């Protein structure tokens, strides 16, 4: 699916990402946008032979197993294909386990290159939430 800015904002909010581990909602909307361009079926093979999956680009080497990846720790205990749905529940729940580890949101490179230190509350100003 390709979401709209406020459409996504309201759904991340329904799943509890507003202020999850103190990251305001706009942080999440902004990272969906520079990771997947709001497209839930986004998939990107990475030089190390792993693939990033779904709207928050969760990686198969650590977070989900997809069969094809050398060393899959599968820490979210999820099939990577579960992340290509249009129901964001499983991509959110694993995002909650990624952001509770050490680096918070810095896990996502696009967030800490395009969102961190900008007015991310702009991604939700205008939405009915």
């Amino acid at each position: 699916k390709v979401f709209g800015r406020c459409e996504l904002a309201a759904a991340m909010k329904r799943h509890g990402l507003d202020n999850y581990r103190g990251y305001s909602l706009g942080n999440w909307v902004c990272a969906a946008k520079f990771e997947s361009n709001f497209n839930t079926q986004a998939t990107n093979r990475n030089t190390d032979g792993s693939t990033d999956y779904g709207i928050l680009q969760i990686n198969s080497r650590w977070w989900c197993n997809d069969g094809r990846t050398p060393g899959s720790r599968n820490l979210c205990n999820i099939p990577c294909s579960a992340l290509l749905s249009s129901d964001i529940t499983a991509s959110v729940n694993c995002a909650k386990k990624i952001v509770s580890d050490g680096n918070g949101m810095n896990a996502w490179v696009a967030w800490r290159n395009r969102c961190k230190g900008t007015d991310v509350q702009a991604w939700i100003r205008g939405c009915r939430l």
Partner: antibody
Amino acid sequence: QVQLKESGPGLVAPSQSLSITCTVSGFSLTGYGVNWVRQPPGKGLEWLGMIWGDGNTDYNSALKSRLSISKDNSKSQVFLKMNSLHTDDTARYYCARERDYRLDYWGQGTTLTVSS
Amino acid sequence: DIQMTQSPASLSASVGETVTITCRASGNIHNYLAWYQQKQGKSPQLLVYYTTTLADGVPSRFSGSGSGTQYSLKINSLQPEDFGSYYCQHFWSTPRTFGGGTKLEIKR
């Protein structure tokens, strides 16, 4: 360990211009915005302006013509310049770190007295 | 722009009392409210952000509340170390504005 220290000129004459530096240590200026707040002796806090991690700056509506903010990322330095000073800008001037819509680390302050 | 109306200006209460401070906004600020405590001649320090979250290291006797335009800071069983000034600040767009302050003072 996050530190914000501001350095001003202490006393300055009315109608001249003021530059205060705020040097930071412990975070990169690219990733956090820094605010400038000030407190007149025996008065509340007043927001002056900010510069976001990406360099965009915002200001108090009413002091917009007099304030100008900028920063040198390399140097870890934010700069505040006021102009057309009046005895009313006699206050303690603080810079604060902003980390996702809360000012979480403040500096000690620098007092500025504007007198002839 | 949005202005904050803090109330009361000053408040006398005994240690162990439970006090409640109030900020009212001229617009919906959508829970982007922070509260700062300032002790005698010290830099303010962050207490509650995004309306209800206690900052790192802050005690459980402190609790933020509100939505839209009416926000509150409740302090329960006041300690000696809680007297001083309290400021709210909104964070909905720029410019940000602080309320006036509430000076919590020891009743005697």
